[PDB]
């Protein structure tokens, strides 16, 4: 059984599909890091119910800063939050997406703990124009896993 990889045009067997598509998605980061991380989130992760919850939780963090872009309390996404850990941290490609759409991974003091915690903090360059994150949110939510197209291989 043969397939055509939509990202490369390569001819693959049923068992070779994930190996070629995953490679093409990881290489795509050199052209469009946001599109590459979106494909990685849906394509690499087999558990699609967790993928849908992960990208919905990411969409909520992005809309929170969109509602109050002048308030610093919505600029930092806590990587150790109970919800983030279950829905987002369990998936491959979600960290690459945050960095691709203008979030820096930093260590900040906690409001109730001595040990610094991990945050994704939105830069001023992207915060100044919420339209960029709003488009990236829709591009992630409207995405589907990448799968090789079945080649009919018409023969007489």
From Swiss-Prot:
Tissues in which the UniProt entry reports expression: Enhanced expression in testis.
Source domain of life: Eukaryota
Domain PUB: 55-124
Subcellular location: Cytoplasm; Cytoplasm, Cytosol; Membrane; Nucleus
Signal peptide annotation: none
Summary of the function given for this chain in its UniProt record: May negatively regulate the ATPase activity of VCP, an ATP-driven segregase that associates with different cofactors to control a wide variety of cellular processes. As a cofactor of VCP, it may play a role in the transport of CAV1 to lysosomes for degradation. It may also play a role in endoplasmic reticulum-associated degradation (ERAD) of misfolded proteins. Together with VCP and other cofactors, it may play a role in macroautophagy, regulating for instance the clearance of damaged lysosomes.
Domain notes: The UBX domain lacks key residues critical for VCP binding.
Complex and partners: Interacts with VCP through the PUB domain (via C-terminus) and VIM motif (via N-terminus); the interaction is direct. Forms a ternary complex with CAV1 and VCP. Interacts with SYVN1. Interacts with HERPUD1. Interacts with VCPKMT. May interact with DERL1. Interacts with PLAA, VCP and YOD1; may form a complex involved in macroautophagy. Interacts with LMAN1.
Protein name, per record: UBX domain-containing protein 6
Species classification: Eukaryota, Metazoa, Chordata, Craniata, Vertebrata
């Amino acid at each position: 059984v043969y397939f055509t990889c939509p990202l490369t045009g390569a001819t693959l067997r049923k068992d070779q599909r994930d190996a070629c598509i995953k490679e093409a998605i990881l290489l795509h980061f050199s052209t469009d890091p946001v599109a590459a991380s979106i494909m990685k989130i849906y394509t690499f992760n087999k558990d699609q119910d967790r993928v849908k919850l992960g990208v919905d939780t990411i969409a909520k963090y992005l809309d929170n800063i969109h509602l109050h872009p002048e308030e610093e309390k919505y600029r930092k996404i806590k990587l150790q939050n109970k919800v983030f850990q279950e829905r987002i941290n369990c998936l491959e490609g979600t960290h690459e997406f945050f960095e691709a759409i203008g979030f820096q991974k930093v260590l900040l003091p906690a409001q109730d703990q001595e040990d610094p915690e991990e945050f994704y903090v939105l830069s001023e360059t992207t915060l100044a124009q919420p339209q960029s994150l709003e488009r990236h949110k829709e591009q992630l939510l409207a995405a589907e896993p990448v799968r090789a197209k079945l080649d009919r291989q018409r023969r007489v």
